[PDB]
């Protein structure tokens, strides 16, 4: 599964963590586009993103982002006018697509206020979803301009799928599974005395990985504890799975279409 998502941040008043408007785009997990209120220009985030794209594309979306930054300040003042909130708050936006490996189309557009679902868009009905009485007023304000809502629906359907398919071809270092994991079992202890089998796997890409423990020929149901798929820092990922030992235990790994088996030594 492949995805293209564009985020927008809107902080009311800045502190040591400047600026007010930040807009960063993503392709699955890697950043591609960079925009901030300090330097009002669209900057690349990936080495393959800087190439394959003309300077006219970077300049076109810069003026578009400069306009969206001005619109975000208006939406911030309007939110401060409707709500009783005054000071420093956050206004978020998220537009994206999820092109499935089979060919299924899924489009989405969302607006947020202080990390909470403010307004959710429904393309099939061409109307916004209000969270409360305060959200209902902005819902009616945006629902008026029919052609504006139709553009959002049209963009998510044909333009967004075409934009994501163009970026996937531009980035060969995304499609590659040329990074197999290093599954190694280690005996760990926190307090005396405790025993656990840590099936630690590192240096894998894509982040999509499956791990499980099997006692002889049966999976340990409602007992296996799982870690987090964490970024190593060198474009690779790490993950683990632990199980409480008692007086055959086998670790099963699924990555890059390869089923890895590890018996306890």
């Amino acid at each position: 599964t492949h995805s293209l998502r564009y985020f927008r941040l809107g902080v009311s008043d800045p502190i040591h963590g400047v600026p007010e408007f930040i807009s960063v785009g993503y392709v699955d997990s890697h950043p591609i586009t960079t925009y901030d209120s300090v330097t009002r220009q669209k900057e690349p985030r990936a080495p393959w993103m800087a190439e394959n794209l003309a300077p006219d594309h970077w300049e076109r979306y810069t003026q578009l982002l400069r306009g969206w930054q001005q619109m975000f300040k208006v939406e911030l003042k309007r939110l401060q006018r409707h709500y009783n909130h005054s000071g420093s708050h956050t206004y978020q936006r998220m537009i994206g697509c999820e092109l499935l490996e089979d060919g299924s189309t899924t489009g989405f557009l969302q607006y947020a206020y202080d990390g909470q679902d403010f307004l959710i868009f429904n393309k099939d009905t061409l109307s916004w979803l209000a969270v409360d009485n305060v959200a209902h007023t902005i819902k009616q304000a945006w629902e008026a301009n029919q052609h504006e809502l139709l553009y959002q629906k049209n963009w998510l359907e044909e333009e967004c799928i075409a934009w994501l398919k163009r970026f996937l071809e531009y980035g060969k270092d995304t499609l590659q599974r040329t990074e197999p994991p290093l599954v190694r079992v280690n005996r760990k202890e926190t307090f005396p005395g405790v025993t656990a089998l840590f099936c630690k796997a590192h240096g894998f890409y894509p982040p999509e990985i499956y791990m499980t423990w099997m006692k002889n020929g049966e999976e340990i149901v409602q007992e296996i504890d799982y870690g987090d798929i964490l970024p190593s820092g060198d474009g690779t990922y790490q993950a683990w799975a632990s199980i409480e030992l008692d007086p055959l235990y086998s670790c099963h790994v699924e990555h890059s279409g390869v089923h890895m088996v590890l018996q306890v030594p």
């Epitope: 999820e98 089979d102 999509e208 499956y210 499980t212 020929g217 049966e218 999976e219 149901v221 296996i224 504890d225 799982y226 987090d228 798929i229 993950a239 099963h252 699924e254 279409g257 089923h259």
Partner: T-cell receptor
Framework: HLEQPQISSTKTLSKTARLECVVS????????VYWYRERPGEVIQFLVS??????????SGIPSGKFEVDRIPETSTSTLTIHNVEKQDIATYYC??????????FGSGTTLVVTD | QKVTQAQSSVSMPVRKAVTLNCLYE???????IFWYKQLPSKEMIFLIR?????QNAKSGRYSVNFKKAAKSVALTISALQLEDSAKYFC?????????????????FGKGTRVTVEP
């Protein structure tokens, strides 16, 4: 598609009983068959699973030598054999298989009746 | 791995909307949530599927309000019908990327009985 020909199977106390499950479209030799039990007033729980290669798998709380699963390539059907049947086995049994390529199909269901 | 369904029996009239709150306790990073409709004639039917990293699924009349941090998978019906009178099931599955070898086991729930009154 999955279909269980037997609607109910009445078996005598502490005796062997076989439960039918016929596949449609895809062959048993290529896929894996899963088996579930739906206890009255309780949760649908997993029993045994036979892999495409031939290996058998179970669930925590099943003794060694109680359930048997077989898939004949000539007839193309999965059969579950329940040994030493007790009053705790009275439930609607379902057979499962993974659909193309996200959902999981389920059989018609076979309720088991145990008598003295 | 366990799925809890607090609602045992729900009575709702036709044309209205009904929300079935389902709670789950799991540990995997990537997983799936399956909703099933078991007819009184023992007929198990698939309705909708909800992925861990996926946006709120909608399959016609059926729509799931997915809460990741709260671990809630509430299914809402757009418009109620006569044929809706059946037992509803809440299932939990893994997200694997290989052949369906005997390990992809669904963790079901207690169940919710729906009796649609005229």
């Amino acid at each position: 598609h999955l279909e269980q020909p037997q609607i109910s199977s009445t078996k005598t106390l502490s005796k062997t009983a076989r439960l039918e499950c016929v596949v449609s479209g895809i062959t048993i030799s290529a896929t894996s068959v899963y088996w579930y039990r739906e206890r009255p007033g309780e949760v649908i729980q997993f029993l045994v699973s036979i892999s495409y290669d031939g290996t058998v798998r179970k669930e925590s709380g099943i003794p060694s030598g109680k359930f048997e699963v077989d898939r004949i390539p000539e007839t193309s059907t999965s059969t579950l054999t329940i040994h030493n049947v007790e009053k705790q086995d009275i439930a609607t049994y379902y057979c499962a298989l993974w659909d193309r390529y996200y959902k999981k199909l389920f059989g018609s269901g076979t309720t088991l009746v145990v008598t003295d | 791995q366990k799925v809890t369904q607090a609602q045992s029996s729900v009575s709702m009239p036709v044309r209205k909307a009904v929300t079935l709150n389902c709670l789950y306790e799991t540990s995997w990073w990537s997983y799936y949530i399956f909703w099933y409709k078991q007819l009184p004639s023992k007929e198990m039917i698939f309705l909708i599927r909800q992925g861990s990293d996926e946006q709120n699924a909608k399959s016609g009349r059926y729509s799931v309000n997915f809460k990741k941090a709260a671990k809630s998978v509430a299914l809402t019906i757009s418009a109620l019908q006569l044929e809706d009178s059946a037992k509803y099931f809440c299932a939990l599955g893994v997200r694997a990327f290989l052949r369906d070898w005997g390990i992809r086991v669904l963790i079901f729930g207690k169940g919710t009985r729906v009796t649609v009154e005229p």
